[PDB]
Scaffold this active site. Sequence first.
Site, PDB file in Angstrom:
ATOM      1  N   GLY A 146      -2.985 -31.122 -26.526  1.00  0.00           N
ATOM      2  CA  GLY A 146      -2.818 -31.051 -25.398  1.00  0.00           C
ATOM      3  C   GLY A 146      -3.590 -30.894 -23.334  1.00  0.00           C
ATOM      4  N   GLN A 147      -3.585 -31.254 -23.287  1.00  0.00           N
ATOM      5  CA  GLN A 147      -4.699 -30.937 -21.386  1.00  0.00           C
ATOM      6  C   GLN A 147      -4.226 -29.631 -21.155  1.00  0.00           C
ATOM      7  OE1 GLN A 147      -5.351 -34.052 -18.431  1.00  0.00           O
ATOM      8  NE2 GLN A 147      -4.718 -32.245 -17.002  1.00  0.00           N
ATOM      9  N   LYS A 148      -2.709 -29.756 -21.445  1.00  0.00           N
ATOM     10  CA  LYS A 148      -1.727 -28.497 -20.888  1.00  0.00           C
ATOM     11  C   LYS A 148      -3.178 -27.299 -21.266  1.00  0.00           C
ATOM     12  CE  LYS A 148       0.516 -25.902 -22.239  1.00  0.00           C
ATOM     13  NZ  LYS A 148       0.968 -24.772 -22.880  1.00  0.00           N
ATOM     14  N   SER A 168       6.249 -26.096 -21.816  1.00  0.00           N
ATOM     15  CA  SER A 168       6.307 -24.528 -22.865  1.00  0.00           C
ATOM     16  C   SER A 168       6.567 -24.258 -23.892  1.00  0.00           C
ATOM     17  CB  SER A 168       4.467 -23.886 -21.882  1.00  0.00           C
ATOM     18  OG  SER A 168       4.565 -22.883 -23.275  1.00  0.00           O
ATOM     19  N   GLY A 217       6.015 -32.184 -24.639  1.00  0.00           N
ATOM     20  CA  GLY A 217       5.300 -32.644 -25.045  1.00  0.00           C
ATOM     21  C   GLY A 217       4.733 -32.715 -26.273  1.00  0.00           C
ATOM     22  N   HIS A 218       5.198 -31.662 -27.493  1.00  0.00           N
ATOM     23  CA  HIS A 218       5.074 -31.798 -28.455  1.00  0.00           C
ATOM     24  C   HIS A 218       5.247 -33.050 -28.932  1.00  0.00           C
ATOM     25  CE1 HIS A 218       5.533 -27.316 -28.003  1.00  0.00           C
ATOM     26  NE2 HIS A 218       3.973 -27.035 -29.494  1.00  0.00           N
ATOM     27  N   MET A 273       2.757 -24.053 -32.642  1.00  0.00           N
ATOM     28  CA  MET A 273       3.197 -23.081 -33.177  1.00  0.00           C
ATOM     29  C   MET A 273       4.353 -22.976 -33.138  1.00  0.00           C
ATOM     30  SD  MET A 273       0.045 -20.367 -31.739  1.00  0.00           S
ATOM     31  CE  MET A 273       1.077 -20.281 -29.575  1.00  0.00           C
ATOM     32  N   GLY A 274       5.369 -23.636 -33.068  1.00  0.00           N
ATOM     33  CA  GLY A 274       7.391 -24.343 -33.280  1.00  0.00           C
ATOM     34  C   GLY A 274       8.053 -24.343 -32.087  1.00  0.00           C
TER      35      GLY A 274
HETATM   36 CL   LIG Z   1       4.315 -25.152 -26.532  1.00  0.00          CL
END
Ligand SMILES: [Cl-]
EC number: 6.3.2.1
Lengths: 283, 283
Positions: free
Chosen positions: A147-149, A185, A37-38, A31-32
């Site tokens: 992501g596991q998050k 995040s 993480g991305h 979602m940008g």
């Molecule tokens: Cl995020």
Amino acid sequence: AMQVITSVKEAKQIVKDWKSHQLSIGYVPTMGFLHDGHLSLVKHAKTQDKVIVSIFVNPMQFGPNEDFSSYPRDLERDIKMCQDNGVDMVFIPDATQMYLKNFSTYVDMNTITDKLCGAKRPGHFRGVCTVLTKFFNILNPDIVYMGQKDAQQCVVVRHMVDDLNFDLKIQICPIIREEDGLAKSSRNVYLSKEERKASLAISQSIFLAEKLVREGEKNTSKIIQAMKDILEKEKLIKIDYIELVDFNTMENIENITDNVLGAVAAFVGKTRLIDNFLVQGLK
Amino acid sequence: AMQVITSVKEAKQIVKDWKSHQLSIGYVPTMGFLHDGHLSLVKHAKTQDKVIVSIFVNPMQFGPNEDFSSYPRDLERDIKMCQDNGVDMVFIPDATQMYLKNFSTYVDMNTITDKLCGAKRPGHFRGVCTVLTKFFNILNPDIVYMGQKDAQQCVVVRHMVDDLNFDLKIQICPIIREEDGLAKSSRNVYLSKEERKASLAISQSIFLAEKLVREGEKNTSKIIQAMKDILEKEKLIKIDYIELVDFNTMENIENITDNVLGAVAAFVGKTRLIDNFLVQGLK
Ligand SMILES: [Cl-]
Ligand SMILES: [Cl-]
Ligand SMILES: [Mg+2]
Ligand SMILES: [Mg+2]
């Protein structure tokens, strides 16, 4: 040159052409307001011949009480990061391309989504399942990197893929963290200096619970209390849930056998943050 | 030689191989006990390089009060008809292949399905949408051939395909009829000699309504009464509904403008039969 594509029709064409050359496709839905993480998902996706990143703040997966209007948005920042990291196509549809005037279909399920965040966020997983079915049909990816998050989301989407026979794999990637331990995040940008300091108790509670588990602690009530004690030291933190659950079913577990997903959701000021640890294959 | 395939894995392999040769795929989903209506769909599908017929009495689309247990079944009859009519693969999964132990996902929608049969058959269209999403994902067809006889179903599935971005087309084919006018259906086999005679009033009411419409009659209440008068002459017939609706929305219409779907559902004895006519592009 990397393609920035806003049209479903054009995204379809590009993917169809890649497939005409038997190229594999790696897909990273986002979602940008992208972060490391991305970038980690993208690095994994580069095992594939072509990498697609979608950017879409999907209105279906937000409720009225949540943060759709304030969600961080900076498409120039995102395009640059995709560009610099070897993304082949950034697909940025708007809600009018994805959801036409009379749109009314959805995908949902009767297990998994009723637990954890699902219980706190009515309609959320339906929004996730529905938008990802659409993206999967549009983009025809071979492996989808998540992501596991968002651990529950990974399990939900894996189950949808199984149940609906999507010809693709969901690959879960580990949590990337800030230098101070906070799980990456986009919502981290909301935190004040003091909230940011408070928020570290979330990852602290995760690191401690995981150490207890790996040291052979089986009693989840003992582990939860230990996490709770850490989190209750921070006045700025309001716990939403702390739960140790089976990673496959999301059902609470009282005594750990082969696996555990220890998951936390908490408000730090008004911002809702999540984190977890996952241990599998225990004896 | 035509392949008779009971495994999802093997169906996937065959389709993947056909695609490796850039062959188009025509798909005819059915619940078996095949008849000339089905053979007509197959003939249309032969415009494609390879033709697949699925046979699966999908338990999700039947309710407790309906006819799942008695539904006509004769797989040898079906295989022979597919064989003789140039079908490339007959895919006959069982419920244990399609719906694994913990299956819990579904596809449904918030418009179209609440009208006509949808209102009389709770859960029916969810069963249809869900099983067809699965078949479409398994078989990766280019064109899917469906009979106008199930007109609402065609519109529902078309809308799902649009909304979920399935990369395929739904092609609606005309109603094939018995020599005496009765719309072809596997459920016709249930009818007694006397019920069969009574059932002709359904097609009669359809032929008359269509003639009235094409003769420029716009008042649907006039047309419905005319159909009702025909059907009420048959004691063995219990009307479920008679409705003239917009073909795109399924909403009842009072005065016909560009289009009309005139649809009938009636019990002849215990058997539930349906029929319709469709007129489009009126001035
Ligand atoms: Cl995020
Ligand atoms: Cl039939
Ligand atoms: Mg694929
Ligand atoms: Mg296709």
